[PDB]
Design an enzyme around this catalytic site. Structure first.
Site, PDB file in Angstrom:
ATOM      1  N   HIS A   1       0.819  -1.213   0.000  1.00  0.00           N
ATOM      2  CA  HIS A   1       0.000   0.000   0.000  1.00  0.00           C
ATOM      3  C   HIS A   1       0.854   1.264   0.000  1.00  0.00           C
ATOM      4  CE1 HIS A   1      -3.448  -2.603   1.394  1.00  0.00           C
ATOM      5  NE2 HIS A   1      -2.429  -3.245   1.936  1.00  0.00           N
TER       6      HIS A   1
ATOM      7  N   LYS B   1      20.199  15.045 -10.216  1.00  0.00           N
ATOM      8  CA  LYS B   1      18.985  14.735 -10.958  1.00  0.00           C
ATOM      9  C   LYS B   1      19.306  13.838 -12.147  1.00  0.00           C
ATOM     10  CE  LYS B   1      15.923  17.741 -11.615  1.00  0.00           C
ATOM     11  NZ  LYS B   1      14.436  17.655 -11.707  1.00  0.00           N
TER      12      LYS B   1
ATOM     13  N   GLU C   1      10.180   6.135 -18.817  1.00  0.00           N
ATOM     14  CA  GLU C   1       9.061   6.887 -19.372  1.00  0.00           C
ATOM     15  C   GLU C   1       8.711   6.405 -20.773  1.00  0.00           C
ATOM     16  OE1 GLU C   1      10.594  10.799 -19.102  1.00  0.00           O
ATOM     17  OE2 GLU C   1      10.700  10.773 -16.909  1.00  0.00           O
TER      18      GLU C   1
ATOM     19  N   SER D   1      21.867  19.272 -16.407  1.00  0.00           N
ATOM     20  CA  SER D   1      22.423  20.552 -15.992  1.00  0.00           C
ATOM     21  C   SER D   1      23.502  20.346 -14.937  1.00  0.00           C
ATOM     22  CB  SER D   1      21.320  21.461 -15.452  1.00  0.00           C
ATOM     23  OG  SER D   1      20.581  22.049 -16.508  1.00  0.00           O
TER      24      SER D   1
END
Ligand SMILES: [Cl-]
Ligand SMILES: [Cl-]
Ligand SMILES: [Cl-]
Ligand SMILES: [Cl-]
Lengths: 462, 462, 462, 462
Positions: free
Chosen positions: D187, D323, D330, D317
């Site tokens: 959950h 990141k 995706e 960047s």
């Protein structure tokens, strides 16, 4: 009229004539979504009865007292046999793991077993809902196990028997119609001939392939998650329980249930339900084609196709003879459309698992059981109330055969292509038959036409 | 052959005749999914050219050099006019934000503007891809803006004009067929009469309602995300840029684009694309019915329904002069099925947004544009190559009118229900017409039948 | 216990305590498909009660005896008020026109009205099921009318009120969370900050747009087919009945019902149901995003995201504090998946109309009513049992804010891009905060960091 | 510039450098639907080249001239090898039987063989498109045969090899992560531990089951319709041609192609395409879960879950060193959503067959091939650019293991449930760890904690 129970949120009145407890009552208050048409499907409740009956037996190997275990087994049998359906008020739209139905089943079985042993209802004495009915310490593997038990039973008992009746009825009609030559239809345009039996043989092959497709989706459904416990590791359960409870379920049902080789795949996803729903989705496409074809073949009586005369089930008007609405065809095609939508709902839920647990379980099994029951029931109704009684309008079929332009290719190895094309071209522009035009043009005589144009010789390769 | 460009991961060979740069070549290398048919749809590329043209003009208010800005505007105009399509090799199956196509557009426009300013390709001098073409500091809002521009333009230029032609042609046929009375069909059974013009007026209303539904989905499409930057806050962009760039896009396109009132809803979800796909899904249900009806009404010529004669656009076999396959009907119904599947794909993508950004954007706009182009093109093709040339087979329609049992109720006030039903049942049993049976029964004259049974009097309420 | 009735197929025993007749009994025997979860939805039965009550009033203008009409009106009221639900045993999977439920309603209303007038049950005296209850001579337009009445009432009474509660609750949370700055997430990666209120404002806009989308689908639902009779021509009905019965339904319900401008479009298709299902399909995508986001935002307490603390509805384990399963989120996302599948089922049925009549009516309205009830009920449950009680873990949110690498862009207009990039690059490889690294590198002092890095200044454009 | 060819409707300008003829040019003119991205998929064109090569070799047994046959075989080989792709301009949205593409193939192969025999393009001398390339007299069976050849080859060459690479890479990661214990998530809440290797073993099983499901759908794909001719009877073809041409295709491809046992099922429906699309739909649910899980496990680096470090393939960047967007995740999840929509489109087409011929063939095979290519390509891309390079963040995993409250049950046998739950509740209230709380409570030593709480002992049943 009520007993008084408590949870950590307050006091709850439980009706004396109910075997569920405060957990079920609280769940009913927190998930008021849909009404009574949305209650957990009965095959899931019965499957829980089979599972708890099997675990209670196996748990005797792990310390469970045989006097309590036997009481649990008899109570679970009453659940599995549909004697306690009125004690399960929860809707599908509960928690995604279905554990609230698991606690519903644990409360009902322990309370009923308590009553069989002369105890006080709601006391958890001497049969505790968790310590005894759920002695396996199973949690997130219970509802997956009940899903596959219910799906396998519904496929074996409802879906495949219904399709088998449809297959045999279509096959009998195919043999009965084996000598009725009719004009074919491609793009809905008049085409070269084939028999009604040949056309119905295509329907037979579709239903045969549908039963094979459904059976091919069953091996993974037979794999049970029981033993995976919370995250699939089997933590808190005893070694050998997973194999033993699956073998006991197999003996109780007569179906080849086994334990899932990978319990993490069995909890984190329900791809076997998606694949079974996919087989029923393919079956829906077959049945849509079959039912719509018969719907149109029976259209008429005078401004339609008029090849078939369907049995009349609803009373018509005495002023409207020959009108027979294909109502079994309409119920079947509506079912097929519903299965296609159910499959998308199954697909969305089956794709949205998160990490160790897919929490779309109740919705997925609801749509799977819904599709299986509808296809099985409609196949029976379509068979008994339409297919077996279908008659062929041989008078109309033979008349349109002789008036069709499609048999003209039988004259090409007699008068050549271009003489045959001119007979068809002229007969089309004149509203005349092929034989009437072939003679009015002086291309052949009547006795030659009947000798060369034989439709029984145009039903196969040469 | 090649020029050499550099990203920080190494060196990349860029073809000498291409305006894209190192980041585009890096992006092609990592997403070899689908082939050339999977490249980003041209309407999205053109929409990016419109957006970059708008941003460059607005960015002059914030210091962008006019000579640089005017070179960007000219290069962006070439993108919007479809002159640089071979400089966008990226597939739809890239990053879910579509920012790799945004960089593709930045590199192409910068290199083309550099070429128009006498510079060297790949130098970033004097037009920088990020510092000049992307001076707005936009990122995750660029592709959503381009999606809505592309969807709105395709709806305005392709979808709605195609449906308008279909509506007008169907309305013309409705008027042309206003006096042709035929037998109706409910459940595919013969029913009380209606005119071909009335039946076609139903198709006209469906197309009219389809255009209203599509227009109803456009207000939220006209809301642009430009100005939300990374997460929707608008960090790193100038106050007023969001409203100005939307107003510039509106003036450039002639469509009522405005800035999205809530940029977080604009980046985190694409429900407007789902609602527009839903309107196209409804339209597909309408066109499926219209095209399938015309398919079956034109079936025959002798064993179908045979009410309509559809135009023959491709030559058929001279041996088969009466066969005209409704190929335009088949292309339309195939397109309708594709739109329904495309809608499910849009739905799954639209449902799977995560926090501040929905990263299913390229696949969502691909399916939306696919459905719009197909629906618009098919409507034009179905109109020009089928609808306008439809002829009624009035000879066959009139014969089946006289042979139908459905006109018998016109005798009820003149001879009574019981005698009328006896005429219907005897005509059905004998294979004869109502008139022949009614006179062989001594129930009326031929003159009484001609005066009492007027189908033109059975087309409305009394 | 039974009375004895007959149809053209044989003798039938009708229970004395039932108001239905032999037509309903025969229908129950011919369509054994699905069980009691498949019975015709109650909103359809009530809508029939409204329709018959309205027609009985209007039919007084056309000869209906006022004493019989008033008896019909009171009996129809009992149907519309849910007092006679147990007298409707038919399943959805009946004839595609739904006329068997129409005859179910006619039998129940006449028998109940007969009893109100002291007559014999099953006698059709003095209130005949067809001659009086169905005096309008309506056939294939009855069930379409009841479909739109039921859909409009369910949207007005269940769907929109449920979504309005959700909209207001999310809006209150947005204002309550308006000053809590958190780290954004794009591609699930750490992103520049935004407030919880801004994130929740996106949810608010989605629900607001969902209510607008549903309302935009209602104008066509308000158009009633009543008056089209068999094929849409209005044959056998009286002039003015279509307008009068629609205006009476509007007065009885308080909703702006009108007569359908084109009755052929109203019978041959149900595109308004497809468009309403499409609006609910879009709503499902919005709710899936909202519920899944809150599901993940409340994940934890220590190995998840831990931004939100959701209310606990099910009892946990005393040994497992901080664990709160997002069970309302799971019920909502399961409902959203079910709506998407229901929409496909509606789409398939809505696309398969044939000529004058679409015969997928019961399945289409079942899935439409199912989607509306689930979305309305789940929105209420999601609101009251989760949204209103959501708390923010501000301690954890602020801690991760200061430890994030995402605020480093606030130092670019002080130390330049490359000095800021080196602080972030070093802090990432060191597991250190931005402030700890900026000072250990000697790039700035603590008092300068707190003066330059202000997250409240990073929430909008400049 | 152009040569001039003729159909019976007029004259047509055929480009001098094209091998197609008048019928192809006529077909392009009448179906301007979609643009160049909508052209017939290359695998179908190549499959036609295989089929025509097979038919020409077999047709020598029935009199086809060897020199003509050997020229056809060489020209057909060029089609199958993808050397003549620019000679097929027809779109998918053509006639529903696909016979226009069949004629496209007949014209191209005939003109190319004419060129290899020194003849003139467009002359039909010495190689006739219909009399020689289509000597088998096949028509409505050609495109179904090409569909199944193209689907089987794409499954064997693209789909299954792609999934095999994904399976093997996931299995390697499972073994590599077999000793890394992490906190489970049910959950999305913290749960009892399991290893990354166990979690990945669940993904491995899903991919293994996906390949088994796809292989299970192939037996009916291997059944070829070649030999059924117009309606399935095989009229105008030679006895034994059906078996021989299937055996020749099997020998040419190395795949177990056989003739369809029932040609009417083979022409009237394409349920095999629906079942194969269903298996790919199940696979998409599996890949959606796998890719979404890896997406979220790699989220962060500091406000996500942070268990995995995914490879960085495109430069980001320098201001944002932590990141790494999961762009391969995706592209995979977008592909999965596309397959689900493609499946609905296949389903609607498969359900809409009419009598002797399903005329939705081109759109069905377009979606099947689209799904197979995307799934195969994405699996390869997801494997090479993400899966193989995944690293575990063992430092973060171990820290969150020690800070989790989920290990507290290991103290139950040593100190009792009541004291263990007190440690859990106090640690949760204080924000401290289980070890710190357990010793500040005087319940155990640090040495007792280290010996009693062993997560490696909580990974299976006891
Ligand atoms: Cl158990
Ligand atoms: Cl920009
Ligand atoms: Cl009525
Ligand atoms: Cl061939």
């Amino acid at each position: 009229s009520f007993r008084i129970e408590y949870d950590t949120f307050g006091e709850l009145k439980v009706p004396n004539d109910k075997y569920y407890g405060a957990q079920t009552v609280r769940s009913t208050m927190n998930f008021k979504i849909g009404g009574v048409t949305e209650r957990m499907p009965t095959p899931v409740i019965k499957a829980f009865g089979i599972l708890k009956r099997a675990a209670a037996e196996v748990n005797q190997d792990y310390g469970l007292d045989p006097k309590i275990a036997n009481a649990i087994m008899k109570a679970a049998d009453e659940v599995a046999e549909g004697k306690l359906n009125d004690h399960f008020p929860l809707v599908v739209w509960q928690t995604g793991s279905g554990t609230q139905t698991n606690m519903n089943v644990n409360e009902v079985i322990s309370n009923r077993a308590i009553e069989m042993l002369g105890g006080e209802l709601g006391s958890k004495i001497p049969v505790h809902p968790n310590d005894h009915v759920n002695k396996s310490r199973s949690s997130n593997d219970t509802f997956p196990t009940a899903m596959h038990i219910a799906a396998a039973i519904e496929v074996h008992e409802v879906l495949l028997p219904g399709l088998q009746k449809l297959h045999d009825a279509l096959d009998a009609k195919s043999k009965e119609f084996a000598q009725i030559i009719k004009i074919g239809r491609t793009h809905t345009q008049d085409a070269v001939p084939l028999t009604l039996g040949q056309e119905f043989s295509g329907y037979v092959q579709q239903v045969k392939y549908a039963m094979t497709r459904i059976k091919a989706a069953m091996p993974r459904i037979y794999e049970l998650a029981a033993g995976g416990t919370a995250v699939g590791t089997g933590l808190n359960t005893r070694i050998g329980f997973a194999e033993k409870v699956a073998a006991k379920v197999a003996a109780l049902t007569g179906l080849p249930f086994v334990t899932a080789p990978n319990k993490f795949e069995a909890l984190a996803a329900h791809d076997a339900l998606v694949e079974l729903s996919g087989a029923m989705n393919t079956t829906a496409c077959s049945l849509m084609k079959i039912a719509n074809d018969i719907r149109f073949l029976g259209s008429g009586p005078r401004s339609g196709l008029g090849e078939l005369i369907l049995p009349e089930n609803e009373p018509g008007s005495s002023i409207m003879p020959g009108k027979v609405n294909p109502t079994q065809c309409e119920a079947m095609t509506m079912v097929a459309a519903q299965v296609m939508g159910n499959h998308v709902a199954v697909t969305v839920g089956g794709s949205n698992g998160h990490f160790e647990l897919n929490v779309f379980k109740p919705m997925m099994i609801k749509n799977v059981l819904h599709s299986a029951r509808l296809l099985g029931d409609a196949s029976v109704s379509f068979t008994e109330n339409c297919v077996v009684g279908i008659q062929a309008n041989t008078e109309r079929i033979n008349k349109l055969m002789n008036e069709s332009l499609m048999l003209v290719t039988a004259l090409n190895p007699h008068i050549g292509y271009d003489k045959a094309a001119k007979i068809a071209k002229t007969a089309h522009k004149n509203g005349s038959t092929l034989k009437e035009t072939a003679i009015e043009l002086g291309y052949l005589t009547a006795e030659q036409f009947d000798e060369w144009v034989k439709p029984k010789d145009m039903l196969g390769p040469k």
